[PDB]
C-alpha cells in the first residue's frame, strides 16, 4: 500500500503475455510466502497465485494454472507473475501480498499493494475529453453549489479526478460506451467560495500518459 | 479443494447494531493446533485489508468491534457495533489446503433512514458543443435506498434514448447513495430546443424532484 508497489499493468491484446512485478519498500520478502490476488471489474475477489519463501513450491488457481508463472528474487527484494495466453476476463486489477510469519502452519495476507491496472482488449488507448459542469445561467443559486466534470471517451480504465488537490466528491463509477468509458465527479462548495474562488478539476489518465486540467468558469 | 460459502451473500444493519456474516468450508481448516480461517475487508478503490486471522486473532490497528469464532467448518465474522466506515464487502480465506480460493464475499450496506434526493441539472459546455456533440448531465444526490428513476424531457416531451445512469458507492460517512444520468446528444438535436428537464421519483415521495434549464434567455 506503501511497503509493497506492484508495476507492469498494461493494455494486452488477446493471447499475448505481460510480466508483473512487486517491489517491496521498507520490507523485506525474505522468510515469507507470498501471493498474487485479483479484483476483475466484477467477479468476487479472487486469489490466483503463492510461492514459498524458497521458491521450490507454488500453486495457483485453476483459472490461471497452466497459464501463468509465479516467481521471486528475495536478494532483490521481488514478487513476479509471468503471464501468457491472455483472456479478456484476465481483465482485472493485481495486487500482491505477503504472508504472515507466523509458526505453527499456514498464514494470512497481511501487507498488500496498491495493485496495478492490466485490461486484455483488442481496443485501442484513448485519452479523455474533460467537459466542466457548471450550473447554467438561470440557475437559481442556492447556499451552496454543486459542480462537476465529465471525463468522457477514454480506454482503458481509469482515470483519477483531484480538485483543487487535496471531501464533498462523489465519484460516479465509469460506464462502458461504444468501447470507450465515461465517468464524471462532482464536488460541492459553498455559493461564496465559487466563483469567487478557483474551482478546477485535474483528470489523470495514466495508459495515455494523460493530464487534462478543467478550471470551472461561471456559465 | 476446499470450497468457501458465504452466508448472506448481502446485508443491511442499522448503525449500532450487529452484522453476523457466516463462512461455511467445505472440509476442515483446523490442524496444528489452529484454525486457518482469514478474513479481509475490501472498500471500493482500496487493496484489500486483512481484520481477522486464524479464526479469531485480531490483526494489529483493526478494532475490537470486529470479532471472529468458530471452527473446523463453520466460521463468523461479527461487527458490533457497525459503524458508517464499515461499508465494504468481507471475505473469508483458508490456508489449511491449497489452493487459497476466497469465498464469494459479503457487501455490507448500512442501513439509515429513508432520505429524497437533491437534483442538480448542467448543460453541455461550450467546449463540448464547440467539438459537436451534447451531453446533458444531472446528478441525483444523497438519497435513500438505492433505488430510484430518473425520467429526461426536452421541451415537455420524455425522452427514452440516449440515457446512462451511474450510482454511487455507498458513502461511507453519510450512508447515502448519489448517481448521474447522462443524456447524449447530438448538437445539432441539443441546439434545436429550448428547456431541458431531469425528474427524479424516489419512493420517498409521489411527486417528482424536477429540475430544469432554457436555452433562449440567457
Known amino acids: 500500500e506503501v511497503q509493497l508497489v506492484e508495476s507492469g499493468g498494461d493494455l494486452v491484446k488477446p493471447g499475448g503475455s505481460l510480466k508483473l512485478s512487486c517491489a517491496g519498500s521498507?520490507?523485506?520478502?525474505?522468510?515469507?510466502?507470498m501471493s498474487w490476488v485479483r479484483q476483475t471489474p466484477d467477479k468476487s475477489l479472487e486469489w490466483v497465485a503463492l510461492?514459498?519463501?524458497?521458491?521450490?513450491?507454488?500453486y495457483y488457481s485453476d483459472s490461471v494454472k497452466g497459464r501463468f508463472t509465479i516467481s521471486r528474487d528475495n536478494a532483490k527484494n521481488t514478487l513476479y507473475l509471468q503471464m501468457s495466453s491472455l483472456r479478456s476476463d484476465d481483465t482485472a486489477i493485481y495486487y500482491c501480498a505477503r504472508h504472515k510469519g507466523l509458526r505453527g502452519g499456514t498464514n494470512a495476507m497481511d501487507y498488500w499493494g496498491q495493485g496495478t491496472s492490466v485490461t486484455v482488449s483488442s481496443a485501442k488507448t484513448t485519452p479523455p475529453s474533460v467537459y466542466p459542469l457548471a450550473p447554467g445561467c438561470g440557475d437559481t443559486t442556492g447556499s451552496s453549489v454543486t459542480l462537476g466534470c465529465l471525463v468522457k471517451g477514454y480506454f482503458p480504465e481509469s482515470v483519477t479526478v483531484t480538485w483543487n488537490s487535496g471531501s464533498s466528491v462523489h465519484t460516479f463509477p465509469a460506464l462502458l460506451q461504444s468501447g470507450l468509458y465515461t465517468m464524471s465527479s462532482s464536488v460541492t462548495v459553498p455559493s461564496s467560495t465559487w466563483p469567487s474562488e478557483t474551482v478546477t478539476c485535474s483528470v489523470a489518465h495514466p495508459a495515455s500518459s494523460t493530464t487534462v486540467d478543467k478550471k470551472l468558469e461561471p456559465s | 479443494d476446499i470450497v468457501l460459502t458465504q452466508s448472506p451473500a448481502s446485508l443491511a444493519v442499522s448503525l449500532g447494531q450487529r452484522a453476523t456474516i457466516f463462512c461455511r468450508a467445505s472440509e476442515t481448516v483446523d490442524s496444528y493446533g489452529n484454525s486457518f480461517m482469514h478474513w479481509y475487508q475490501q472498500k471500493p478503490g482500496q487493496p484489500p485489508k486483512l481484520l481477522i486471522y486464524?479464526?479469531?486473532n485480531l490483526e494489529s490497528g483493526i478494532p475490537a468491534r470486529f470479532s471472529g469464532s468458530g471452527s473446523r467448518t463453520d466460521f463468523t465474522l461479527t461487527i458490533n457495533p457497525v459503524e458508517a466506515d464499515d461499508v465494504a464487502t468481507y471475505y473469508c480465506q483458508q490456508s489449511n489446503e491449497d489452493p487459497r480460493t476466497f469465498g464469494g464475499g459479503t457487501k455490507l450496506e448500512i442501513k439509515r433512514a429513508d432520505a429524497a434526493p437533491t437534483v442538480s441539472i448542467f448543460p453541455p459546455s461550450s467546449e463540448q458543443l464547440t467539438s459537436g456533440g451534447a451531453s446533458v448531465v444531472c446528478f441525483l444526490n444523497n438519497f435513500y435506498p438505492k433505488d430510484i428513476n430518473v425520467k429526461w424531457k426536452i421541451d415537455g416531451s420524455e425522452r427514452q434514448n440516449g440515457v446512462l445512469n451511474s450510482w454511487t458507492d455507498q458513502n461511507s460517512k453519510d450512508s447515502t447513495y448519489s448517481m448521474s444520468s447522462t443524456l447524449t446528444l447530438t448538437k445539432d438535436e441539443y441546439e434545436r430546443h429550448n428547456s431541458y428537464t431531469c425528474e427524479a421519483t424516489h419512493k420517498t415521495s409521489t411527486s417528482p424532484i424536477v429540475k430544469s434549464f432554457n436555452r433562449n434567455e440567457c
Open positions: 510461492i514459498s519463501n524458497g521458491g521450490s513450491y507454488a
Open positions: 521498507g520490507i523485506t520478502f525474505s522468510g515469507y510466502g
Open positions: 486464524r479464526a479469531s
